[PDB]
Design a binder for this molecule. Structure first.
Ligand SMILES: OC[C@H]1O[C@H](O[C@@H]2[C@@H](O)[C@@H](O)O[C@H](CO)[C@H]2O)[C@H](O)[C@@H](O)[C@@H]1O
Length: 921
């Protein structure tokens, strides 16, 4: 039975909430923080200065240095530190060796670019009340710094969009000694969950109010079982009462519709309205809470006599470290997320197989179980790419071992899978069993690679194996060590098709407070665990990522690693999933806003356990779950140890047939999924896209989180996620023509609206937007690897303009050769009765081995949906490619009831890597 801190039980949460209550209550609250104007200098894209915080009635002050940066991107950055702790002029309690300064290495872990300062940014106006800086593209952005009381105001297009400290909630808890008097009851030791945090530094939280001016919707800060449009947190009907929490934790049977923390945290929030978008990124690795309220601008937000325009007020606070925030002014969603990704990284190029279907449970119990499941999937014509081994494969929960009784020949199991280009994934968690005759633990201790307690002893606690120690992946040497442990000749029973799953990396500690480590544990650098908690997961995933780059000499290849816990930047390192969900309809429905929130926070490679993890889903739920799951960028079935076997072939008819069809759709679209990952790699474009992203001009889109577009395809999905539903209402975003993917029925033309669509169990509700081209592979195979050289079908979807565009990206799916241009990237354009293929980047024609072999690979088929009538009774198209011209057969099919006119060209016979031109009509 799990115990979680509510705000009031977290000391620094209580104090910041109470500081907010006081400020909103008080008459003429002023933030007791001022820039000393004469400390101010602007140079070379950067203001620096000293804020003075007034700490008492007597006017005594402390010095907090302020750094405001204006980046070339047109992002700004605001940092506040504490001068006394920069200089070491404090004393820790208990003779702690913990670092005196404010944690300042989050940047190091997270930021990989976009830091170049804009020398074209400049002071427009100054005096000794305030200064305004102009920055970003042709100086369209303004920041007005106010000195007294400190505030910042971020503007563009003649208005404030984001304000810092307008409510006067700035709070840097300055260091103080523990002294009896000449409410401090949460300042020092705090007890929770069987543990007492010694709290050697005392109070050190950082907080700020950030207002989004004229914005009614905000989004991000995953992961939460919450809508995509975030709720208010200060009570009221359909609101929460607690702030949103980010404190990566192992939350057994986490509930729906809640601001409680889950397993990963990305403190990035965006605000969206019609044709305007902004956002912020709160770069802090400590426990972080976010309150959100919405109302009028007046101090009483329900007052009469004022403008009705809504502002969203947010109140951010973290336990320790710097106050460090980035500000994005957009003005589109695409802009914001694109800039965020320049800072924190784009999605890594994935292993192509990892977009396939993954089959998992706790546990497959032998190598015979695995090999039998493999054969059963082929027998029932259910394609999949990966079979997964959970923790029972180990020798008594020791990582880098196998149970010999149960897994006799892991190499042989390996090789059966390799017969179909399939892969094996095996779990490795960060806890190392504290036992005898275990070289891994000996090396961990002796090399000093383990996480430590508050007095420098090696931390010990309980997880799967019993007593355990934890690798300290913040330590570069622990990462270098770890890399060694995964070589094929070192990690026996693994081979080239073996990849890795990290869980329990929050870290999960069974006997620990909130199932994690004490706050006063110590890491490499002597940082407290409180400083770095939300980075821990990602440190561990990073270590594992780099271990898979090269596992034998001459190997250099893309890792695939699934993580449970994560942070900003984890997108560079692999996939995630939403942890231990439950086999129930509510969880299926909730999966979609969660997965969407992931990608709009820059970490799109995301999914939830298909079927739900806890319990036994009914057969219709499981079937629906496959129909949703084929639209997760990470698509894996998984099941708890007490759950019945539910490998998909066990479901029974008619469900087997329906689930097989879902799988085949996923596989057929694999070329378009892969292309969407490509874009995610190139500029952080989400893989599936909410309406607010694709249609920033459509106000009615803002709260919608149960449908989405796929990549660049124009495919609009809305899976059924309610019990016994046999139809679905799809919001049509705009006036373009939308076609049923299966029948080509015209659903809407001409007008935005809600359209009703037949949706029985056997139906996947999926629409094709006019204006788009996308590629698929129609030939069914048993895995993605066996699709590698099959021909493509292009679908050209036309509206009234009879124009479209789309794209296709391909490469070997495995190497870093894409970095030297070993790839095919096609842009397809439909215009004036002509489909053309050109290089996406406009490269001229040096061919490696994969590219050479692609010469045998063709577009063989083109389907045109919404074909124009003037094609009626024309029997050929003209095809040109690589100097050669020919005719190919086309059949035109006239419209018929609500079904569209379409046309089909078979046997196109043009190689996918070359320019081409096809003239219709
Ligand atoms: O490795 C086995 C599973 O571990 C994790 O799940 C846990 C869950 O199964 C349950 O037993 O409770 C503990 C404590 O909260 C959880 O950590 C993974 O999330 C799961 O995917 C694995 O199958």
């Amino acid at each position: 039975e799990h115990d979680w801190k509510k705000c009031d039980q977290s000391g620094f949460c209580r104090r910041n909430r109470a500081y907010a209550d006081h400020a909103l209550s008080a008459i003429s609250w002023e933030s007791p923080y001022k820039i000393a104007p004469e400390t101010g200098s602007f140079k070379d894209g950067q203001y620096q200065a000293i804020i003075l915080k007034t700490i008492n009635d007597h006017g005594e002050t402390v010095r907090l240095p302020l750094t405001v940066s204006f980046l070339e991107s047109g992002t700004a950055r605001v940092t506040i530190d504490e001068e006394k702790r920069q200089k070491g002029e404090i004393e820790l309690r208990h003779d702690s060796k913990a670092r005196k300064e404010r944690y300042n290495e989050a940047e190091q872990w997270v930021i990989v670019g976009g830091m170049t300062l804009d020398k074209g940014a400049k002071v427009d106006y100054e005096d000794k009340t305030q200064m305004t800086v102009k920055y970003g593209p042709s100086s369209k952005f303004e920041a007005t710094i106010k000195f007294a009381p400190f505030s910042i105001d971020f503007k563009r297009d003649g208005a404030s969009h984001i304000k810092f400290n307008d409510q006067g909630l700035l709070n840097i808890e300055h260091w103080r000694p523990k002294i009896d008097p000449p409410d401090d009851s949460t300042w020092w030791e705090e007890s929770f969950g069987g543990n007492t945090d010694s709290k050697p530094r005392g109070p050190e939280s950082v907080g700020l109010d950030i207002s989004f001016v004229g914005y009614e919707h905000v989004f991000g800060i995953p992961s939460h079982a919450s809508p995509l449009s975030l709720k208010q947190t200060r009570g009221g009907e359909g609101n929460y009462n607690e702030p949103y929490r980010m404190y990566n934790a192992d939350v057994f049977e986490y509930i729906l519709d809640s601001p409680m923390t889950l397993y990963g945290s990305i403190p990035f929030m965006q605000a969206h309205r019609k044709d305007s978008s902004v956002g912020i990124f709160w770069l802090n690795a400590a426990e972080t809470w976010v309150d959100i309220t919405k109302g009028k601008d007046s101090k009483n937000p329900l007052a009469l006599g004022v403008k009705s325009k809504i502002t969203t007020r947010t109140h951010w606070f973290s336990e320790s470290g710097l106050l460090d925030v980035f500000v994005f002014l957009g003005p589109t969603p695409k802009d914001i997320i694109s800039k965020y990704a320049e800072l924190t990284g784009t999605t890594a190029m994935p292993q192509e197989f990892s977009l396939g279907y993954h089959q998992c449970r706790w546990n497959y119990v032998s190598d015979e179980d695995v090999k039998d499941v493999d054969r059963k999937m082929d027998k029932f014509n259910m394609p999949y790419d990966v079979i997964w081994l959970d923790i029972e494969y180990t020798d008594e929960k020791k990582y880098f071992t196998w149970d010999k009784h149960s897994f006799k020949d892991p190499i042989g199991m390996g090789k059966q899978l390799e017969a179909h280009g399939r892969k094996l994934v095996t779990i490795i968690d960060p806890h190392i069993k504290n036992t005898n005759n275990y070289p891994v633990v000996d090396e961990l201790k002796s090399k000093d690679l383990a996480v430590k307690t508050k007095d420098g002893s090696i931390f010990e606690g309980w997880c799967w194996p019993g007593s355990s120690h934890w690798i300290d992946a913040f330590n570069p040497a622990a990462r270098e060590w770890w890399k060694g442990l995964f070589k094929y000749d070192k990690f026996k029973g693994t081979m080239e098709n073996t990849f890795i799953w990290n869980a329990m990396n929050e870290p999960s500690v069974f006997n620990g407070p909130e199932v994690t480590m004490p706050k006063d544990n110590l890491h490499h650098g002597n940082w407290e665990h409180r400083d770095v908690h939300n980075l821990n997961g990602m440190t561990f995933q990073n270590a594992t990522y780099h271990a898979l780059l090269s596992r034998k000499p001459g190997e250099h290849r893309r890792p695939f690693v699934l993580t449970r816990a994560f942070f900003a930047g984890s997108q560079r390192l692999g996939a995630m999933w939403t942890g231990d969900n439950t086999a129930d309809w509510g969880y299926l429905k909730a999966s979609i806003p969660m997965v969407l929130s992931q990608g709009i926070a820059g970490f799109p490679f995301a999914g939830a356990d298909v079927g739900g993890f806890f319990g036994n889903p009914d057969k219709d739920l499981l079937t629906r779950w496959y129909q949703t799951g084929i639209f997760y960028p990470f698509f894996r079935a998984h099941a708890h140890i007490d759950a019945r076997r539910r490998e998909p072939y066990l479901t029974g008819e008619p469900y087997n047939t329906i689930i097989a069809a879902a799988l085949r759709l996923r596989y057929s679209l694999l070329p378009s999924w892969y292309t969407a990952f490509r874009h995610a790699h190139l500029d952080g474009t989400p893989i599936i896209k909410p309406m607010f992203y694709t249609h920033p001009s459509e106000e009615a889109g803002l709260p919608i989180d149960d449908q989405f577009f796929i990549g660049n395809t124009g495919l609009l999905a809305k899976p059924v996620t309610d019990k016994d539903r046999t139809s679905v209402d799809i919001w049509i975003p705009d006036s373009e023509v939308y076609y049923d993917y299966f029948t080509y029925d015209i659903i809407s033309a001409a007008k935005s609206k809600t359209a009703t669509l037949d949706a029985p169990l056997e139906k996947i509700p999926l629409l094709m937007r006019g204006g788009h081209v996308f590629a698929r592979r129609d030939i069914p195979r048993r895995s993605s690897a066996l699709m590698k050289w099959d021909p493509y079908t292009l679908v050209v979807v036309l509206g009234n303009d009879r124009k479209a565009e789309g794209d296709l990206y391909v490469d070997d799916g495995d190497s870093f050769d894409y970095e030297k241009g070993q790839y095919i990237h096609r842009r397809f354009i439909f215009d004036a009765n002509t489909l053309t293929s050109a290089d996406y980047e406009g490269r001229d024609d040096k061919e490696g081995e994969w590219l050479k072999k692609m010469r045998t690979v063709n577009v063989e088929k083109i389907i045109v949906v919404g074909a124009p009538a003037a094609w009626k009774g024309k029997k050929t198209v003209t095809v040109e490619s690589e100097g050669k011209t020919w005719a190919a057969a086309i059949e035109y099919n006239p419209a018929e009831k609500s079904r569209a006119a379409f046309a089909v060209v078979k046997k196109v016979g043009v190689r996918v890597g070359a320019d081409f031109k096809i003239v219709f009509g």
